[PDB]
Ligand binder design. Sequence first.
Ligand SMILES: Cn1cnc(Cn2c(=O)nc(Nc3cc4cn(C)nc4cc3Cl)n(Cc3cc(F)c(F)cc3F)c2=O)n1
Ligand SMILES: Cn1cnc(Cn2c(=O)nc(Nc3cc4cn(C)nc4cc3Cl)n(Cc3cc(F)c(F)cc3F)c2=O)n1
Lengths: 298, 298
Amino acid sequence: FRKMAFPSGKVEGCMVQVTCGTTTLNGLWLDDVVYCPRHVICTSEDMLNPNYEDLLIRKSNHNFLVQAGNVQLRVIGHSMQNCVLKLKVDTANPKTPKYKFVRIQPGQTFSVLACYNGSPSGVYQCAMRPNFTIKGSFLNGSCGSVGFNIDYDCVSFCYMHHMELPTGVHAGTDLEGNFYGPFVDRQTAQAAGTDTTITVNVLAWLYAAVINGDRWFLNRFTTTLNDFNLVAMKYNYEPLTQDHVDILGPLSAQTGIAVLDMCASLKELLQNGMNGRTILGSALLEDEFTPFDVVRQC
Amino acid sequence: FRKMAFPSGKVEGCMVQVTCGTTTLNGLWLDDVVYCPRHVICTSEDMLNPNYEDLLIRKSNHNFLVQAGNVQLRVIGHSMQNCVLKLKVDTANPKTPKYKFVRIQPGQTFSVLACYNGSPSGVYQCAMRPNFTIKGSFLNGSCGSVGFNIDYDCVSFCYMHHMELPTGVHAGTDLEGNFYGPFVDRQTAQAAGTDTTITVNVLAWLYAAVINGDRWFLNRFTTTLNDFNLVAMKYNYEPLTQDHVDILGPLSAQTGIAVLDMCASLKELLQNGMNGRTILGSALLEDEFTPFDVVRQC
Ligand SMILES: Cn1cnc(Cn2c(=O)nc(Nc3cc4cn(C)nc4cc3Cl)n(Cc3cc(F)c(F)cc3F)c2=O)n1
Ligand SMILES: Cn1cnc(Cn2c(=O)nc(Nc3cc4cn(C)nc4cc3Cl)n(Cc3cc(F)c(F)cc3F)c2=O)n1
């Protein structure tokens, strides 16, 4: 098993460049609106402690250079929604897919189309960490790149990239401009909270192991969810939610292994280690494959 | 530092479904020609031991059903080039990108657009193994999926997927229909030669590790190129050539770590193991990033 991204074509056709003065980043063109980080309105001297309200009042439509490739899109309206700028343009994007805006939970995965100057450059799968960062791969110029899932030709946009943190992890917003985590769009040092292991995804990976016949870790025990959650936190593992139990349903049904029985097998692995035995050819327990990812690849 | 694929939109626009009787798989539609594995002309019985020239002479254009999404493309000519069938259709693909067909060499990487019944499903990065297999992620229905690289809006197609071997690795052809490796397009158990590790790629990845702050494996030991290659060969690593050393030049300059100095680090890793430590989060030495892949991502 390896990480696989969604085909990126439906998002590639929406990527544009947005420039304000010399400040430049990526934007997302859906119907007749371009969405982008409001940080674009900052000059170099504004980036440290921007007053976005004061910065926006000084701007008019004609101060925004929006380009699809070399082709300018004329801006006919602008507004700010939390940390995203919405630029109304005079042309509806003919490549607009069916889409929605969603806000994801930690542990959920998504594909990232990394872009530079409005030009798509690469695609890879990412997971939202419990500390609301993502361990992405981004260079300078990537601000405004988006993350997404595709379900039955509908693109669910979930992430817009804003910044890199001092630890090298990445932070951003949903497409309504609300940050994941306790971050602000200022060029100031912001540390991520202490991270934890995504339990629901480790469990998904154990189910993937069982589906593939690697099942030595299945023990003869069960547990309650509450008991498991209390032990999990002692090992820096996330507690499971009721939604987590439910999204493990399909894998539990496919394998005949009750979710709480798998929890008991994982608890044994936390309290005793793996004894130099491997699971799916890996000595480490993978935590960036969701239950949906497992059924998708198997 | 992530495994990163090229944006797949230019290739998505070219995927179609090809069917002959009950047999169906993916094709690549460029201008007025659809390219697909010639295995599509086999019945269940033919697959086990096909005489392809015999099977093809017994086919007419009307025996080929090509579907592009909802629309059927009329076949007006057909021919065979090695293991690839070329179907002339009465319609040019308006989404045809600038493209070339290239045959890649062991160790080089490419993006795979995995498709099922003509519909793109996922994108990920692969390497051509020294034994001319690829460790892909492919399911039933993926026959005809292609691998590619993109340079300045030109798609270089390098791989067309044919089959999964008993070990779970994958085998295929270039777009002229010539297999990579000693395989044949027949449904019979086929083994590959013993694989080796792509040394220049391991070194590139070690540089990626240093660039991203992971330095524990460095040492003050030295080695000559020949003495490194003696140890590498002992451990079933491919030889490192002076061309490889030259290609690693930019990463040596960026990090200030001489190539032969990084060879001395790798030598110790081969001889001592990783002592339970990880590099870029991996417990094993990763060999599917080329030097160009590392430079581009870093
Ligand atoms: C290495 N890396 C990894 N991810 C990132 C993302 N990123 C970015 O692409 N750009 C940023 N600052 C800008 C500088 C500009 C210079 N010009 C001429 N134009 C520019 C546009 C931008 Cl956005 N930043 C920093 C950053 C961006 C924010 F949106 C924010 F709220 C705070 C920040 F500190 C950045 O992280 N780079
Ligand atoms: C698990 N897996 C991973 N990769 C693959 C690729 N693959 C494939 O997709 N299909 C194959 N056989 C077919 C059966 C069909 C049944 N119908 C109704 N239509 C079919 C079409 C195909 Cl192609 N194979 C097997 C295979 C395909 C070849 F092209 C070949 F030369 C030898 C082979 F043994 C397959 O490997 N499956």
